[PDB]
mmCIF file with all atom_site columns, C-alpha atoms in Angstrom:
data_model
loop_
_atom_site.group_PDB
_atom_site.id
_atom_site.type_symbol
_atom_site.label_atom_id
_atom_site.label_alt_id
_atom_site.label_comp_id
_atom_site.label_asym_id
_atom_site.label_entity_id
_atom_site.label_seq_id
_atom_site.pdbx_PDB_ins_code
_atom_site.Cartn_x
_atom_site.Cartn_y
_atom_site.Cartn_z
_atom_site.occupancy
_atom_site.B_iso_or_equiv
_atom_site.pdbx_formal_charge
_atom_site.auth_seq_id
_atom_site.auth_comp_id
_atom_site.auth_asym_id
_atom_site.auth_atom_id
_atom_site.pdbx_PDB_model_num
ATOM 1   C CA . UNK A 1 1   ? -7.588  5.230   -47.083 1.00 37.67 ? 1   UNK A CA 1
ATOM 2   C CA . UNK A 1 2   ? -5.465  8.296   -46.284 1.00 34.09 ? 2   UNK A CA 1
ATOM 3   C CA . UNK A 1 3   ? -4.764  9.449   -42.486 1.00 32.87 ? 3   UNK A CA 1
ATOM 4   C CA . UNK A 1 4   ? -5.332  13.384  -43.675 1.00 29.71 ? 4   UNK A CA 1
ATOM 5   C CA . UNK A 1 5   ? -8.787  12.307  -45.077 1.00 29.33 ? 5   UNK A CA 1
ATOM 6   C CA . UNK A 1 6   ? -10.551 12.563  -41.676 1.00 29.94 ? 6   UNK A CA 1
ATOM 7   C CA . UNK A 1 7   ? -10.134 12.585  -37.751 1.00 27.22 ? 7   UNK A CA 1
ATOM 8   C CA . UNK A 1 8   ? -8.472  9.744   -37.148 1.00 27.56 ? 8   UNK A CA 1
ATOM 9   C CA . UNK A 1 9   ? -10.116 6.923   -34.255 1.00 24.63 ? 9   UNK A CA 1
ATOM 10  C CA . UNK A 1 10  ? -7.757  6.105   -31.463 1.00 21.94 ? 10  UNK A CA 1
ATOM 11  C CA . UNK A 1 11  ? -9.010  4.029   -28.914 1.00 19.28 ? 11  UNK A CA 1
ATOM 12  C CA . UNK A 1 12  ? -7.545  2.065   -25.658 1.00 18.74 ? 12  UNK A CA 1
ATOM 13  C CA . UNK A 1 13  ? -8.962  -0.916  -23.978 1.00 20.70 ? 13  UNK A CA 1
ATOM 14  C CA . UNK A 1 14  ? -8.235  -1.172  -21.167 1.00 22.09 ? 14  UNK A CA 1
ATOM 15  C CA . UNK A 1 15  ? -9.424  -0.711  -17.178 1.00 21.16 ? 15  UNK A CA 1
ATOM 16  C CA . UNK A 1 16  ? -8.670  0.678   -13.808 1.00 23.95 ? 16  UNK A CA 1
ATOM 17  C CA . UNK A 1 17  ? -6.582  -1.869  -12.668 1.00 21.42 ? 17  UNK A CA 1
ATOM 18  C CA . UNK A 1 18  ? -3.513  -3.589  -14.192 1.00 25.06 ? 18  UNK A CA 1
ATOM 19  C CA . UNK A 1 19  ? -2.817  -6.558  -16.250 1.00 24.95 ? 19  UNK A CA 1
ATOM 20  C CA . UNK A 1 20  ? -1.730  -9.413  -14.919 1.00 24.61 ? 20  UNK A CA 1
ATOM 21  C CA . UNK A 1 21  ? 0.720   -10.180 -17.980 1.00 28.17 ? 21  UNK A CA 1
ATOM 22  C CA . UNK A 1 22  ? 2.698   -6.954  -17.618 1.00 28.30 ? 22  UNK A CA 1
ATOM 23  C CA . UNK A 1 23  ? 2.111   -5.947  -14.000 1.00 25.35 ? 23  UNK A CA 1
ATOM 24  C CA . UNK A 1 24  ? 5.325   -3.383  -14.159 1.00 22.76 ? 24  UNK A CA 1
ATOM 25  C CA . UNK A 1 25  ? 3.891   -1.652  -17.748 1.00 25.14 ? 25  UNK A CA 1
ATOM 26  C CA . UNK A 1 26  ? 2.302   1.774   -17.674 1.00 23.51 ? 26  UNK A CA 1
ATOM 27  C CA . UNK A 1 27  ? -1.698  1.567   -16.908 1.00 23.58 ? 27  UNK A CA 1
ATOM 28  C CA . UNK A 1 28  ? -4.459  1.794   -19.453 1.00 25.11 ? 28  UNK A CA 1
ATOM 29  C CA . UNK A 1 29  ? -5.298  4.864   -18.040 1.00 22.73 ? 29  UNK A CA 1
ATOM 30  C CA . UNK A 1 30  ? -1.466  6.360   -18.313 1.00 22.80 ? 30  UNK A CA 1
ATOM 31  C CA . UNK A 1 31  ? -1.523  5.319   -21.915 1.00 25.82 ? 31  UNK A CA 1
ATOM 32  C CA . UNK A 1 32  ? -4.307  7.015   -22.744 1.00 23.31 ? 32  UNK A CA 1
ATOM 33  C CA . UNK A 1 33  ? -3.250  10.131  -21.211 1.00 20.50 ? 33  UNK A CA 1
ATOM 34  C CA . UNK A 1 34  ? 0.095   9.720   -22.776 1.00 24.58 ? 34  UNK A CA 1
ATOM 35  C CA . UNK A 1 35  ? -0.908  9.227   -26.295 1.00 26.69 ? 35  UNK A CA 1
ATOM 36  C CA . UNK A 1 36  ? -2.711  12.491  -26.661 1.00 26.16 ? 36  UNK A CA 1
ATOM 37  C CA . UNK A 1 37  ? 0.230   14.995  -26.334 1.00 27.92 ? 37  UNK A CA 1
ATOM 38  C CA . UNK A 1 38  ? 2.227   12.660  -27.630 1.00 26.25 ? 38  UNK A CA 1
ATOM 39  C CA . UNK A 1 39  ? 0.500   12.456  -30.831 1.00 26.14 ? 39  UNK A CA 1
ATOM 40  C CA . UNK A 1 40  ? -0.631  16.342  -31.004 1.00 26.30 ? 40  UNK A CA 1
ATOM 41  C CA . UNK A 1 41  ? 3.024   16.695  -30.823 1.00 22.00 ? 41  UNK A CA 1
ATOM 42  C CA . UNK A 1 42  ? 4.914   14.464  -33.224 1.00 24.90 ? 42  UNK A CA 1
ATOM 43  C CA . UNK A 1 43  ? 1.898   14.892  -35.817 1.00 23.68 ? 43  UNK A CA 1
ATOM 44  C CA . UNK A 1 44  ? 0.477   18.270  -35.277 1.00 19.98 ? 44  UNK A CA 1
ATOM 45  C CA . UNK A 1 45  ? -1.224  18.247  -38.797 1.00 19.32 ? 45  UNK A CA 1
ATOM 46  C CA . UNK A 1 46  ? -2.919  15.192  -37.883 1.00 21.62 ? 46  UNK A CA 1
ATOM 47  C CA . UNK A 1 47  ? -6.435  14.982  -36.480 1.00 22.63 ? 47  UNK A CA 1
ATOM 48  C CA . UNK A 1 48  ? -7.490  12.071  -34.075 1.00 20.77 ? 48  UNK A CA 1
ATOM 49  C CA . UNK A 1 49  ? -9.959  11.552  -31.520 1.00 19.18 ? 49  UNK A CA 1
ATOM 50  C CA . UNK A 1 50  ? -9.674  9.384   -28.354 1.00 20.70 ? 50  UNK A CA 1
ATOM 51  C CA . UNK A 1 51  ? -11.668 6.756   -26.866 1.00 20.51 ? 51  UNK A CA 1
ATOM 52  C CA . UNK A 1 52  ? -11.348 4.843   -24.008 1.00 18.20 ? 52  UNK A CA 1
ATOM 53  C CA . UNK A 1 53  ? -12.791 1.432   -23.348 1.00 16.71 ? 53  UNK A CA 1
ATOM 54  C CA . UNK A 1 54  ? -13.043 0.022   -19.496 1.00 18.15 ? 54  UNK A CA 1
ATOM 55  C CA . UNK A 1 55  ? -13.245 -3.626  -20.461 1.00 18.10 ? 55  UNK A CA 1
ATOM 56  C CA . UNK A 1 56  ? -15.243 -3.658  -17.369 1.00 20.20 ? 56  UNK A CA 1
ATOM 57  C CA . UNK A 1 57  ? -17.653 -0.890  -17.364 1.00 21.98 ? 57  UNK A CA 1
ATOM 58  C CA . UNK A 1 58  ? -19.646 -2.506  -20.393 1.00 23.64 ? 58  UNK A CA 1
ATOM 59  C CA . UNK A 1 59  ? -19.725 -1.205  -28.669 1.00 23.84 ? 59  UNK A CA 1
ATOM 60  C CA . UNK A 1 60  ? -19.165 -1.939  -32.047 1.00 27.67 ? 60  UNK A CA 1
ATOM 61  C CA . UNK A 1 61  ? -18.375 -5.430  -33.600 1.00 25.44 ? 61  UNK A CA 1
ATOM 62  C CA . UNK A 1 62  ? -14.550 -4.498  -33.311 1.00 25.27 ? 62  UNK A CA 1
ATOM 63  C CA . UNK A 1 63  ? -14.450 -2.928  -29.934 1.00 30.37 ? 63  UNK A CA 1
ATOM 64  C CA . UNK A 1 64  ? -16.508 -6.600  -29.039 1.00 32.91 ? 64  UNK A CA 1
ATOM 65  C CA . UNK A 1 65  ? -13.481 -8.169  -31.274 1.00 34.02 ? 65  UNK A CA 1
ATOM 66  C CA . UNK A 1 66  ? -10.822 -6.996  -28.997 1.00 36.99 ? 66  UNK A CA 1
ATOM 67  C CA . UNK A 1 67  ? -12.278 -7.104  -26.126 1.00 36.82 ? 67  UNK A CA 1
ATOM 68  C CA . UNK A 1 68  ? -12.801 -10.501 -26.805 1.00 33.20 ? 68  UNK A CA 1
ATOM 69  C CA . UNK A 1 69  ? -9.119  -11.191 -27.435 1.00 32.39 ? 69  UNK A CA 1
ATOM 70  C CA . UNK A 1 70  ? -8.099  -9.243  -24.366 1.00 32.57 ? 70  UNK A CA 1
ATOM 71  C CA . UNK A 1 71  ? -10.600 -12.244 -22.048 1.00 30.50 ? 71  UNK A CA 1
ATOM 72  C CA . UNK A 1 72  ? -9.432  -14.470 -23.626 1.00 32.47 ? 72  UNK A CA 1
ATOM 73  C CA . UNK A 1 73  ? -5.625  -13.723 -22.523 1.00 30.86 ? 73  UNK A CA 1
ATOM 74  C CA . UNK A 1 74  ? -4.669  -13.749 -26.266 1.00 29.26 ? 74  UNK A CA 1
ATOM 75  C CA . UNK A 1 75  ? -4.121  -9.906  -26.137 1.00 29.56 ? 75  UNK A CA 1
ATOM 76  C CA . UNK A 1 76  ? -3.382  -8.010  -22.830 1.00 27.50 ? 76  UNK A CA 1
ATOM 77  C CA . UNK A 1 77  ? -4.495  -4.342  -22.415 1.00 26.41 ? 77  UNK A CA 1
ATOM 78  C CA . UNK A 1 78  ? -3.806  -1.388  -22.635 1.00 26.33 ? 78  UNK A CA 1
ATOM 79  C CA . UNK A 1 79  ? -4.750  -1.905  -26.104 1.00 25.59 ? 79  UNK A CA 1
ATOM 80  C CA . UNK A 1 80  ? -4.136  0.718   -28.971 1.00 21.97 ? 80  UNK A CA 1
ATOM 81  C CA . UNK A 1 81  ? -6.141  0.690   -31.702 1.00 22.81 ? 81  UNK A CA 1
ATOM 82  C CA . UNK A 1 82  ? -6.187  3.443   -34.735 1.00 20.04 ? 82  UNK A CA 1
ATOM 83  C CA . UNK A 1 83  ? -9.470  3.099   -37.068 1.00 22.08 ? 83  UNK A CA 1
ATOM 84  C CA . UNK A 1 84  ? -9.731  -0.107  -35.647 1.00 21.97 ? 84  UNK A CA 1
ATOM 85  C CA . UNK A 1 85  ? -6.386  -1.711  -36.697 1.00 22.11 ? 85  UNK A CA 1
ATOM 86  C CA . UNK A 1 86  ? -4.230  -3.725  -34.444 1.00 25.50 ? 86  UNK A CA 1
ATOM 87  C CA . UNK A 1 87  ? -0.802  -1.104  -33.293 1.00 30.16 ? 87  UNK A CA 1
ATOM 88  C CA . UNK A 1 88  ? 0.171   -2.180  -29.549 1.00 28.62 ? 88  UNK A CA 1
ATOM 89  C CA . UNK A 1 89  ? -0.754  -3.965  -26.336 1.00 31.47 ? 89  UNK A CA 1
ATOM 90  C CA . UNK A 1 90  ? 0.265   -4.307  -22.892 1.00 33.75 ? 90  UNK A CA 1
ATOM 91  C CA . UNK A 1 91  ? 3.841   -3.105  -23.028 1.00 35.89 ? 91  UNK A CA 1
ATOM 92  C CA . UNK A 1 92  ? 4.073   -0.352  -25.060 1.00 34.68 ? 92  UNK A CA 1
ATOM 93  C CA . UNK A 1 93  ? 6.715   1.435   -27.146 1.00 34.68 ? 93  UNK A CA 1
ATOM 94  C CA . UNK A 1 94  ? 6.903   5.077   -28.554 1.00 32.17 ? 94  UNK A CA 1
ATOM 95  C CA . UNK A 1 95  ? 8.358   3.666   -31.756 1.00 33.26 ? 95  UNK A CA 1
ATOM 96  C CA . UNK A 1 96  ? 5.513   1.029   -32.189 1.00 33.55 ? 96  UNK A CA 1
ATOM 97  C CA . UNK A 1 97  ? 2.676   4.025   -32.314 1.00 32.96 ? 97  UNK A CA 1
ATOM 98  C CA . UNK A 1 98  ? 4.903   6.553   -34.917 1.00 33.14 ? 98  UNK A CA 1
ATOM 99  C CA . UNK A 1 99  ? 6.242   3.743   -36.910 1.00 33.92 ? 99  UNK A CA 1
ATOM 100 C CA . UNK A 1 100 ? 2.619   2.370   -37.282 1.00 37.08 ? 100 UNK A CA 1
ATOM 101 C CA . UNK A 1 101 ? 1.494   5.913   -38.359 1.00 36.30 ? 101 UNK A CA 1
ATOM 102 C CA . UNK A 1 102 ? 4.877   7.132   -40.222 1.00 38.08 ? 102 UNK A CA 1
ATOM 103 C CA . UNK A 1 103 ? 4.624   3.751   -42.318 1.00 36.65 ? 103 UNK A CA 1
ATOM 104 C CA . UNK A 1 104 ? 1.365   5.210   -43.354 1.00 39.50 ? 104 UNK A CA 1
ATOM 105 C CA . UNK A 1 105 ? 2.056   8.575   -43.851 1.00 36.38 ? 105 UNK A CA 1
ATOM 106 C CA . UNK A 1 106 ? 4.689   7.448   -46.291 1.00 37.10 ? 106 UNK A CA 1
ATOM 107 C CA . UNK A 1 107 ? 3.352   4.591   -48.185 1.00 37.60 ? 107 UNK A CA 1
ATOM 108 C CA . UNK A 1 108 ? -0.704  5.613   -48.093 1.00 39.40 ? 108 UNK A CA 1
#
């Protein structure tokens, strides 16, 4: 796999109200406003497209999968996934989403 190959999937889990286990941390709904620029910025030649999942609201067997994790309490939310994989949740650093992407970029 190769991140230039094709628009890249970004989604959040999340919903419209906070979680519990980081009640200070940025909403899902920030996040996912946040990661857009932030992204069209730092990677420009990069294509991705953005999803956003209200937990709530109520898929495919991995937005089930996290989800799942997230009721459980094992992950918390906002949740970032890129093509599915595991990069951050709950509180959320700038570093964890380009060092997940820059250790592609430079090893795949």
């Amino acid at each position: 796999a190769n991140l230039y190959f094709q628009s890249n999937a970004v989604v959040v889990y999340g919903a419209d109200v906070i979680c519990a286990s980081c009640v200070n941390a940025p909403t899902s709904k920030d996040i996912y406003d946040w990661l857009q620029p932030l992204l069209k910025r730092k990677y420009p030649n990069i294509s991705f497209k953005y999803t956003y999942i209200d937990i709530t609201k109520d898929l495919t067997d991995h937005d089930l999968q996290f989800i799942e994790r997230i009721e459980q309490d094992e992950l918390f939310y906002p949740l970032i996934t890129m093509n599915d994989e595991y990069v951050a949740d709950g509180y959320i650093q700038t570093k964890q989403i380009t060092r997940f992407i820059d250790q592609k970029l430079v090893n795949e």
